[PDB]
Amino acid sequence: ADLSLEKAANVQWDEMADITGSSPIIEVKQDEDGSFSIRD
């Protein structure tokens, strides 16, 4: 059973929210197997 009746919100933008920093350059090998990974 995989019901998805629980809907919390919509597609509402909110610039009164919290901010978290990052923006790094990460070496990533994309596999058709599944997800991402690091190099070497």
């Binding site: 009746l5 919100a9 933008w13 990052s22 923006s23 350059i25």
Partner: protein, 590 residues
């Protein structure tokens, strides 16, 4: 609309999806192919991509925009037990060899994957829920996102439209009901032609709410002034053309799986094309492999892995481990019922669940392929016609049997083969898969190359026999459909019978269960239907063999005589069932 959560010793969510643009959007790891329970039916995955981890339920995708290089993308955070908490961020970049795509680093706990991310202002810009953990960096998640009703002229008279519809392009579920709807809005006498009864049933299910009347071949004609659409099989339509002067002059005829090489179907296409030329109807031929196509590897909506290797013709012992090691469901196409049995037994020896299919056992063995779970489905070419399976692999030796009318000496129909199939046949066998997306691409395992030239096929001549035996306002002669016209050199109307011979010819096929060629040979000789003496007065070489012994039949009167027909058709003793029926006929039982 909005954004909903996907929930599963209790109730707990495993991910989040977007219910917008009339579609539900998630990722593979969240659902792995399933169903969603709402009043709006059940959501089923129409498209997926494991390389990018995405799944679109019931149509789509969609959505679909893209974030600016220096855009402050904000992520919605609907999590199990928590409220939606927006978080604005300055996204990064995950460099890959296919290309670099942005990646946000936000700490969120398992089960919240698939939550929307937003552009600077307004619509949705992508989905969040996939990334990689760094040994140095705390976390990161890649901004994942992928790229990316019918004409009114299709109803115009004196026009035949061929709709190359791949399954599933929503032909049965979306397209056909739309065509029937528009047909009903335009007050058109609509006819729907299905290859088999089960397909007609699927149409009935897909056309719920519409005035649809199923037509049985036990009825020569049917009429009501209640503005209704007729739904019947090809052969029903043909026999009705052969048995009733009260045929409706339909102004819109739609034939599904219009690639069917069955004589009834070919003749049907001939008559329909003829009516179109007469400007009294508009036709729609729906088929993934139209008569003007020679592509064994067409494009599907799900990825298909085309594998070529050696395939067993008979029972095997060793070497073919790849067959049994496959742990999914498989559809194996055999040239004949004999080979089918020989394969099925060898498969069951390995402990596999095998269901066999053929023409005369289709209506009773095909539903078994849906209710019960199985391992293998061994089938003749009958499954090239709208047969839908929940499998992942198709084994196709690309070999078949072909009825051929030997004219060298006394005319006789043989079953030449096993002979390589037509490219269209191969495409249709391959078309059984590549329908519903899975993490493992559907495998089409094949062998040998298809052969184009099938102009010695008996079904063309038989179709010609069926066509010119149909009454029509003169001077108009029912000729074969355009593309199929060049496959016979038979002069038009050279198979025309008169009166009682024609009636006998129809009854031999409808009540005698005899092939078209055999029925024509018996009818055009002046033999009555109940006269069965011709089944015994044949040449010494026309002796029929059953399990390596000469068949002997007790006649209707009560006399034993060897089964030795005046005209030999290989199709009446190909398989035990056909031979049983023909033995029932020769005894004067039916």
């Amino acid at each position: 609309e909005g954004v909903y959560r996907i929930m599963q010793s209790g109730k707990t969510q495993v991910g989040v999806g977007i219910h917008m643009e009339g579609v539900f959007h998630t990722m593979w790891h969240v659902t792995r192919g399933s169903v969603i329970c709402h009043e709006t039916g059940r959501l089923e995955p129409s498209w997926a991509d494991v390389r990018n981890d995405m799944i679109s339920y019931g149509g789509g995708w969609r959505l679909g925009d893209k974030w600016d290089k220096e855009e402050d993308v904000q992520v919605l955070a609907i999590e199990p037990g928590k409220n939606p908490k927006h978080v604005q961020t300055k996204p990064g970049l995950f460099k890959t060899l296919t290309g670099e795509i942005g990646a946000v680093t936000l700490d969120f706990k398992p089960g919240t994957s698939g939550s929307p991310i937003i552009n600077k202002k307004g619509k949705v810009i992508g989905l969040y829920g996939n990334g990689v953990v760094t040994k140095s960096g705390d976390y990161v998640s890649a901004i994942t996102q992928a790229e990316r009703e019918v004409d009114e002229d299709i109803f115009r008279k004196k026009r035949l439209t061929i709709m190359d519809l791949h399954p599933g392009a929503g032909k049965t579920k979306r397209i056909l009901p739309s065509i029937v709807r528009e047909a009903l809005k335009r007050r058109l006498r609509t006819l729907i032609l299905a290859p088999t009864r089960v397909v007609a049933a699927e149409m009935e299910e897909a056309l719920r709410g519409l005035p649809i009347r199923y037509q049985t071949p036990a009825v020569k004609s049917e009429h009501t002034g209640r503005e209704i659409v007729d739904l019947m099989c090809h052969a029903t339509f043909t026999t009705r053309l052969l048995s009733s002067t009260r045929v409706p002059n339909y102004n819109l005829i739609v034939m599904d799986e219009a690639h069917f090489t069955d004589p009834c179907s070919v003749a049907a296409r001939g008559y329909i094309s003829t009516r179109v030329e007469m400007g009294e109807a508009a036709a729609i031929f729906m088929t993934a492999t139209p008569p003007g196509s020679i592509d064994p590897f067409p494009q599907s909506n799900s990825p298909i892995e085309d594998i070529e290797r050696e395939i067993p013709e008979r029972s095997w012992n060793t070497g073919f481990d790849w067959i049994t090691d496959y742990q999914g469901k498989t559809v194996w196409f055999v040239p004949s019922i004999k080979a089918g049995n020989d394969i099925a037994n060898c498969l069951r020896k390995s402990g596999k669940k095998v269901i066999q299919l053929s023409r005369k056992t289709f209506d009773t063995e095909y539903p078994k392929t849906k209710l019960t779970d199985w391992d293998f489905v061994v089938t003749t070419d009958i499954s090239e016609m709208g047969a839908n399976f929940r499998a992942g692999r198709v084994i196709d030796p690309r070999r078949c049997l072909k009825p051929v009318i030997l004219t060298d000496g006394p005319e006789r129909v043989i079953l030449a083969g096993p002979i390589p199939v037509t490219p269209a046949s191969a495409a249709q066998r391959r078309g059984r898969i590549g329908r519903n997306p899975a993490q493992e691409d559907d495998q089409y395992v094949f062998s040998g190359d298809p052969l184009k030239n099938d102009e010695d096929h008996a079904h063309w001549t038989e179709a010609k026999m069926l066509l010119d035996n149909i009454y029509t306002p003169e001077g108009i002669i029912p000729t074969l459909f355009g593309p199929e016209r060049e496959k016979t050199q038979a002069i038009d109307g050279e198979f025309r019978l008169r009166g009682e011979q024609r009636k006998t010819f129809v009854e031999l096929m409808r009540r005698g269960d005899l092939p078209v060629w055999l029925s024509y040979k018996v009818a055009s000789a002046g033999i009555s239907y109940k006269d069965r003496e011709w089944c015994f007065t044949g040449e010494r070489n026309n002796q029929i063999l059953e399990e390596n012994m000469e068949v002997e039949i007790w006649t209707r009167e009560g006399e034993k005589k060897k089964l030795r027909p005046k005209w030999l058709d290989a199709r009446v003793y190909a398989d035990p069932m056909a031979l049983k029926d023909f033995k029932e006929f020769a005894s004067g039982r039916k």
